[PDB]
């Protein structure tokens, strides 16, 4: 589940540029 969370965060970052 850790990688799955890094995955969600990265996809959000590409959108929002955190």
């Amino acid at each position: 589940s850790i990688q799955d969370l890094r995955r969600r965060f990265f996809l959000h970052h590409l959108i929002a540029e955190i």
Partner: antibody
Amino acid sequence: EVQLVESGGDLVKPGGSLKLSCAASGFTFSSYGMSWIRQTPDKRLEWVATISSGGSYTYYPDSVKGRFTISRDNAKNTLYLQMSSLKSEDTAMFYCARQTTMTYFAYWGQGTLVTVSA
Amino acid sequence: QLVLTQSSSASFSLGASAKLTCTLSSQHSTYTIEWYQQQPLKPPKYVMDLKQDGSHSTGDGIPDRFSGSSSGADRYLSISNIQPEDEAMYICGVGDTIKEQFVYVFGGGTKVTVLG
């Protein structure tokens, strides 16, 4: 009706350069990360480059880092892949792809063929 | 090394249930992966996301005959009532960020033939 149309593929000599473009429509271009994925003659797929929605962040695998530059012009709904120091192993069909909030490469273009040869 | 292993080809009879396997390298057995489909002479397309627990999300317009499931390091794409248009190459993919670095890997793809 999401659409991605890549152009710019062509014959290039080894050591050469080539710039590909991807024209996008049917969605809000500036809200999404965009990427390039290539497919070589053996049919294997290889991720090439990813850029965040505003262009502030770019990602590349070792195979092309330093040689390939992904960029975009949000005012023109266009994505670009500038390539340099090309080798014959780089020959492949290059595709442009757009993310979804849940996945990386949800919609793909038709592809543009890059042939590196003497 | 992040590696996805898939058999290069597979055959199934029209109407049967098919199952394709993508196996993650051991250290990455908990990873969520993606499935893609590529029909002859055509662009690859997105099929679905598949998590370690077997939950999955299908792309727009994918037939419900396509479903995913998992078992440890294996990631499966199942196709019920396999049809002639399901004939294609199926490829799995998986991404991960290591520090501030992104890597994304594809499996070798499985060429699927529909017999009968």
